[PDB]
Write a protein that binds this ligand. Structure first.
Ligand SMILES: *C(=O)/C=C/c1ccc(O)cc1
Length: 125
């Protein structure tokens, strides 16, 4: 277990040091996206929540391919505003329901420390 709390003020500083293997030790789901929504990282906790195989979704587009239920003003719309603004920090509840049992989650999106990367953090509620 990597000891980082969901919603920590400086989470993007803490996660900047972690390889794929360390990300898999987190207590919550973590996805790293580029500015276009392509998945750069996807940890084991997230695969446990959603059923997706982490290695097979890297390189796919989260909003177009993997998670079409997030293609809406309430999720994707907030992401694209943050990318265009260069700043993003928002937390909200959502239901994941594509090809899965509908699962309610808390979502935290935050701009990463590195240039053109954005974190999506997920935990059950
Ligand atoms: C809605 O289609 C959500 C799908 C989804 C959310 C999060 C993931 O990690 C994978 C699929």
């Amino acid at each position: 277990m990597e000891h980082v709390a969901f919603g920590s003020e400086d989470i993007e500083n803490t996660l900047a040091k972690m390889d794929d293997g360390q990300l898999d030790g987190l207590a919550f789901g973590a996805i790293q996206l580029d500015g276009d929504g392509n998945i750069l990282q996807y940890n084991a906790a997230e695969g446990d929540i959603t059923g997706r195989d982490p290695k097979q979704v890297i390189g796919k587009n989260f909003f177009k391919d993997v998670a079409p239920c997030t293609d809406s003003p309430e999720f994707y719309g907030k992401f694209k505003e943050g990318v265009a603004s260069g700043n993003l920090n928002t937390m909200f509840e959502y239901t994941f329901d594509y090809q899965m049992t509908p699962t309610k989650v808390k979502v935290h999106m935050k701009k990463a420390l590195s240039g053109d990367s954005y974190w999506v953090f997920v935990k059950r509620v």
